[PDB]
Amino acid sequence: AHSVKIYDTCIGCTQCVRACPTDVLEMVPWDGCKASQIASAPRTEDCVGCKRCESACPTDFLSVRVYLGAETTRSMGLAY
Amino acid sequence: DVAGLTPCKESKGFAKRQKQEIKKLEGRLKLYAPDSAPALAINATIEKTKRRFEFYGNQGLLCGTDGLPHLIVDGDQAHLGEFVYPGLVFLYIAGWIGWVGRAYLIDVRTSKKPTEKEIIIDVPLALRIMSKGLTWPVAAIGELRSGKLVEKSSNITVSPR
Amino acid sequence: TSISDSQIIVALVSAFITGILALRLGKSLYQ
Amino acid sequence: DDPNRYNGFQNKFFETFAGAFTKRGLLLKFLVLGGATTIGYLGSTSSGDLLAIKNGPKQAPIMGPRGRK
Amino acid sequence: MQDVKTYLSTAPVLATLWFGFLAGLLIEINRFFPDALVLPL
Amino acid sequence: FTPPTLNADTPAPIFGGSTGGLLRKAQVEEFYVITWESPKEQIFEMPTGGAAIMRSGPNLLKLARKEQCLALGARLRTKFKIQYQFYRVFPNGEVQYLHPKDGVYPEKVNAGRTAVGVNNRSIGQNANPAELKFAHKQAYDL
Amino acid sequence: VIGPKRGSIVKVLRRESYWFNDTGKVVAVDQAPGVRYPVVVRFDKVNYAGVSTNNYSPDELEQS
Amino acid sequence: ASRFPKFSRGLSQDPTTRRIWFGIATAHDFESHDDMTEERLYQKIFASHFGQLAIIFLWTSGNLFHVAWQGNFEAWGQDPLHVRPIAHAIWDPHFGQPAVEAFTRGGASGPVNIAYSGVYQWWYTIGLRTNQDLYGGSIFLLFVSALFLIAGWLHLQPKWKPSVSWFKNAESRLNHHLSGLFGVSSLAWTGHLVHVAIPESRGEHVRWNNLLTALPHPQGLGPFFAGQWNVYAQNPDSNSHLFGTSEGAGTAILTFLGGFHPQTQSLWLTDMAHHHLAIAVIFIIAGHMYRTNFGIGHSMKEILEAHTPPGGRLGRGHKGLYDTINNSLHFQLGLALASLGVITSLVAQHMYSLPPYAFLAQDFTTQAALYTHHQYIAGFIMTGAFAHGAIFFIRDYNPEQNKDNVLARMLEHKEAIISHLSWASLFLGFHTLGLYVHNDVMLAFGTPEKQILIEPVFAQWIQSAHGKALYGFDVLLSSADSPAFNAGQTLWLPGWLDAINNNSNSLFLTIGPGDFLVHHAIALGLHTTTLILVKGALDARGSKLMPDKKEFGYSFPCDGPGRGGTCDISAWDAFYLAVFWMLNTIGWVTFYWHWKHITLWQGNVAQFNESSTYLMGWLRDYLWLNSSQLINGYNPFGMNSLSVWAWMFLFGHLVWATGFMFLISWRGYWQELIETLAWAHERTPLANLVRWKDKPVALSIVQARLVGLAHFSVGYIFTYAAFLIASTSGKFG
Amino acid sequence: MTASYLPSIFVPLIGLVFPAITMASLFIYIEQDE
Ligand code: CLA
Ligand code: CLA
Ligand code: CLA
Ligand code: CLA
Ligand code: CLA
Ligand code: CLA
Ligand code: CLA
Ligand SMILES: CC1=C(/C=C/C(C)=C/C=C/C(C)=C/C=C/C=C(C)/C=C/C=C(C)/C=C/C2=C(C)CCCC2(C)C)C(C)(C)CCC1
């Protein structure tokens, strides 16, 4: 499906996980920020490409990036 | 004559247009009583047209084929009053406006809440800024030569390459 | 003067051969 | 899923062999040939009355402006 | 009066006043100096 | 954490039917099944359009998309304070536990979770596409 | 210490930042060993998302 | 699983109709195909070029065959000024009898189309006279296209596939293309003109059976090899010469007269022969510049490195440009399209004022169609050049090798470039629109003497410097004492001055305030289209809103509603937005050309001179006035030969509006509607038995933009072509 | 025109039959699963 990437600029605010409508992102332990956590995308095959996770990231430029592509059945959001 | 244009004083098309406009106004006038207000308005129209055409003739405008004044904007000394003189007047006014606006922006960037000063204009500050636009070219040259007019490229936000 | 039926059929055959060559080039571009 | 609908259907099975169990081989080729030949024959053998394009012009040329013909 | 003066100093009210003054000035100038294509000098 | 199994004896909410529901995709490709526990009979809004009463206890609802499952679950969590979990069901009878992969919701950081897709550099430090010409890989994949 | 002093005026060298070649105020610097972007910078003007603060490493910030 | 888009695994696995659309629309993007190697890329491009050459030659051979088979080429040649050319016959089964008899023109026995491509004039000029000549040419071009197809197949074979290094041999390619492709081809064409075209225009009949017998000049090749070339210009054709007839003909084969043929109002054949000979010599000389295999020539890379100013104002100069240009096919494509668009504009601007074909100036509809054709082609080519420059920046630009050279310096100060283009566009638009509205209001109030009519004195001064005596500037070939006039009075000025002082042709037409305003509108259009295109090209790699735009490619929909919204943020979207502006600009250009030439041909140029200064004149005296015969092509009282153009006029209007549909409503409405329709089909009896295989989805965002653009452009082109042809042919004036 | 019947032959083919065969072949090709 689409490709979702997380960068070291993340601050572990979890706001991208809460905005995801298909449960693609999750928070994992990390040691590069004060929050001691970082976002991750273990199940991007369920990603639809809404980039709501991108709109919720507060860093200057996005620590979470969605690149789109493939456009499989789950990606197109088809119920038929 | 500056692109085969005859002066409008001896332009037959210019006189023809004079005659046609006056005749049309008089034809519109014939259907009103002499003492009526519409008659006064139409007679004022006729006087206005006559003085307009006399003024156009007296300034040596160049009429082409038929009667239509044409403007020469090449810098000819005989036509400086068409573009160069009003052009300079415009440049003075436009530079006034821009310069005073820039001055106001400068004078409100040092304020504690500049955005409130932009949506709610400080009328006394704005007016004493506007008063300074009389000698705007001198101030512009002074700022250009001193280096306070142009920001250095090292302090201006640019996108990645 | 006007062209004859022999010329018409010669043109048709030439176009058919050019079509064969076109199909060949298309198959060569395909793979 | 009731199987008893028709009684006399030997003729329909007998007469339909070119289409059934042929798919791309026979039916499609037959259809292409019998459409191409059919339309070609109709367009080549149509008379003037039925088809106006083959009737041809009947009045004099209308002729164009500036004397160009 | 502080609040009234602040409201009158807002962008739209000041724009209305300034542009109306400019329009009146131009209209009166055209009343007394109409239909000129050339600046006489 | 042992994933729960999908019970086939869980009553469904009281719903009167809708044109927004399972279609041919549900029977040829996949569908989803969300389960939650409710303390009382209350009215909620179906993600496909309409209203229903959830049972005073276990519930079992069939959906056509994962996004609808998340929408209903989010409303349940932030409105009725109800824990939920859903599964992906295939036409061959395969059931896959989906949302709490480790039993903890993704918003809370949990140990034992692996970092997938995490890049150890800034987003602006990506390689240019020109350097990766004729190589079947992307700049963000490095 | 790690980076600039608290309250100091720093200029951003991140090319992808909305505030490249812009000045901000340092709010806090974290001394925890392992933090990659510990310096917190406040800015007078917001970015497109509406955020006026960010985190930078000391090597991409210079003193005025 | 290896479905229709065999070059893309992702599209093949798409279970929607998007797979079909994107496989159709991404076929020729070879660099994007899976498992693509540069060697295979170059060989595929080579074979595709062969295929395109074959297609072009087939197209021209079909034109020749149809003119030979269904045309009146011989009848037209016997009487060009009173015979309408025939393009091809019509066999429409849907016609009625009135349509059959309405379209029977040109002395045909049935419905025919009247050609407006100028092929009749062009073929008559180059010596073709009978239908057998055209048939032979068509057969020959069929053979040529077959040969190119054979070559394209051959060079794809394992033992004749060229290597990448062969494809990157720039010096040898330039040498061969300048010497042979450009120079030797022009030499051969001037040989044709000397041997066939000129004798044909002088009454002689030279064909393959007497090429070695027919003597082009009485003194053949003697004075050529003796250095006394003037013998080939001693006896030019007189002014009483009739084209194709021995009466009044001369014996010179390479003259230098200049001007126009008095009877055909076209350039002399001998002048064109000497032209082609001279440029052939120049090109053959120029093609010996670069170093290929013999130790002499130039190294283009070293030329580029050497050209760096010592002051550092240009940075490193042109260092690294050779590799950047030779390694990037998109840079080469952009340069080629830029040059081709400029040259197409040049062709359009030079063939209407200097008609090279006999009896082409008298054919007004043909001239108008040719001008509009090549101008629209040029505009599209320019948009393509800029789009491919953007694609170069995204996909082929390496900042590492291009460090501080001219390209890097353009990227560095791109904000200045874009801001100054914005200022120029704003100034031009504001002031031109304001002057037009001023003139409109003055005409509305009944006071036309108050218009701001600015005389285009700079262009009139240039016209006077070209010999135009109408404006009385008396300088540079308008004055007898000028050294240029004295130098030229012996060679071309006798013809050039006569042609330019004739106001019945289109050689340096008289211009006025309307011409000033419309040229400034043209400058506005060019500047704004260039602003959009350059902004797309220079912001393609990134911007403040999307610093990482290069990783997303050239054509992507958006970056989502975050950061305020990112619609049309890609460079492809800049091209999408610039296509509208180029269409508008070429529309203005062609509107001006067409109106100027309607009022010139009818003899009443006062209408243009008085009405073109205000926009109501443009609407009424050009659009409303000239569409009367167009809209009457078919009516309740009957129909005529302009019915097809009326129908195409309405058709173009309809396609334009459908483009509006695809451009306004964006995606979601249709996706929800398609969801509803899928439900409806799945729930309908006797129809749920029929099932789709590709799940129906609404068109994507980029696809929607492209489809709307295609509809918009097709409607634009068809509507204007129908109006142009109908209004120039309904009244041959 | 040397052969007036030849348009009446060719136009129907390239107008109806050639599109029919072309679209049928392309529909069969783009709907393959392989
Ligand atoms: C200048 C025109 C031109 C050229 C040179 C090419 C060249 C190519 N295209 Mg493109 N294409 C074009 C126009 C062109 N196309 C147009 C207008 C469209 C529609 C939008 C497409 C749509 C398109 C798609 C969707 C695909 C291609 C593909 C290809 C490749 C050919 C492989 C293939 O499937 O052949 C198709 C043709 C044949 C296999 C053989 C037939 C050859 C022609 C078309 C007909 C020959 C005559 C015919 C038999 C009738 C005569 C009858 C009798 C005389 C024999 C090649 C790179 C394919 C590819 O692999 O891309 C990389 C591919 O998938 N093209
Ligand atoms: C950019 C385009 C453009 C341009 C160049 C013009 C230019 C002109 N228009 Mg047109 N017009 C335009 C757009 C434009 N208009 C549009 C869009 C419309 C539609 C709304 C009109 C509608 C329109 C009408 C209906 C009329 C004009 C008229 C005029 C003329 C004089 C107007 C006027 O107030 O002068 C009078 C002069 C002034 C107001 C002078 C400026 C005074 C300021 C305050 C400066 C004061 C002096 C300064 C401080 C010191 C300078 C130095 C000193 C030595 C002089 C002038 C030729 C009028 C005319 O006479 O036609 C020929 C007229 O009747 N226009
Ligand atoms: C003398 C040797 C020679 C010659 C004749 C050619 C000839 C050609 N090569 Mg080149 N080539 C050569 C050596 C040569 N090559 C060498 C040594 C190499 C490398 C070792 C290459 C590498 C190479 C590549 C890589 C490619 C070619 C291609 C081509 C063909 C493209 C021509 C085209 O589309 O525009 C021809 C256009 C003109 C002749 C018109 C020019 C006129 C200008 C614009 C002035 C205006 C005049 C105007 C048009 C006249 C009006 C006419 C009007 C009445 C209709 C052409 C036949 C390309 C191709 O298509 O391959 C199939 C291609 O891709 N060649
Ligand atoms: C979409 C593309 C397109 C189309 C459809 C047209 C269509 C047309 N053009 Mg335009 N044109 C275009 C693009 C296009 N043009 C561009 C991009 C240019 C700029 C280069 C031109 C430049 C141009 C000129 C300068 C002229 C035309 C003309 C024409 C018309 C005649 C048909 C034609 O070109 O003959 C098709 C002809 C061929 C395909 C054959 C060309 C091959 C030449 C002869 C090669 C010569 C080399 C030779 C083989 C070497 C000999 C080898 C050895 C013996 C030494 C027609 C309206 C002519 C016109 O209006 O006449 C009325 C005309 O004079 N066009
Ligand atoms: C020498 C000429 C030339 C060459 C070799 C190329 C080659 C290429 N271009 Mg470029 N291009 C050109 C000219 C050229 N282009 C011009 C003149 C323009 C301006 C219009 C463009 C604008 C352009 C853009 C904007 C893009 C390309 C892209 C591409 C690449 C892929 C094209 C593709 O997918 O084809 C498949 C062909 C199509 C999709 C075209 C389909 C048909 C179109 C929509 C017109 C149909 C009109 C109408 C429906 C038909 C007539 C109907 C009738 C009733 C009137 C390829 C490398 C793309 C690329 O590189 O991707 C990164 C890309 O994004 N080109
Ligand atoms: C008639 C239609 C129209 C008009 C007037 C404009 C005007 C403009 N476009 Mg737009 N555009 C249009 C159609 C139009 N466009 C369409 C159909 C497309 C295709 C989608 C585009 C695509 C497009 C792009 C992609 C770009 C532009 C740009 C521009 C600017 C070019 C510079 C210029 O002319 O400055 C002169 C300004 C004008 C002509 C605007 C009108 C000014 C009015 C008349 C003055 C105000 C009058 C009055 C006081 C207002 C009263 C309202 C209220 C207060 C009562 C300008 C703002 C470019 C730009 O912004 O660059 C700077 C740019 O990048 N346009
Ligand atoms: C591209 C050139 C071209 C074009 C546009 C046309 C157009 C037309 N032809 Mg002509 N034709 C051409 C070349 C061309 N012809 C050639 C070279 C020959 C010699 C065999 C003929 C022989 C011919 C006859 C005998 C007849 C027509 C007829 C027709 C008309 C109906 C279509 C038809 O039946 O086609 C039939 C066409 C052929 C049998 C020729 C084969 C196809 C040619 C070679 C072009 C194919 C490739 C081309 C590049 C298209 C690519 C497809 C796409 C990517 C654009 C139509 C006006 C008919 C007519 O006049 O009706 C009034 C008719 O009876 N054509
Ligand atoms: C983006 C880009 C691109 C593209 C671009 C373009 C498209 C451009 C264009 C450009 C152009 C389009 C240009 C033009 C130019 C022109 C010129 C420069 C001119 C000149 C002229 C002259 C010089 C003249 C002279 C003369 C005259 C005046 C007349 C008489 C004669 C004589 C000769 C004396 C590319 C891909 C490359 C790459 C990247 C970047």
Ligand code: SF4
């Ligand atoms: S990616 Fe952004 S939104 Fe998500 S946790 Fe990291 S900083 Fe927060």
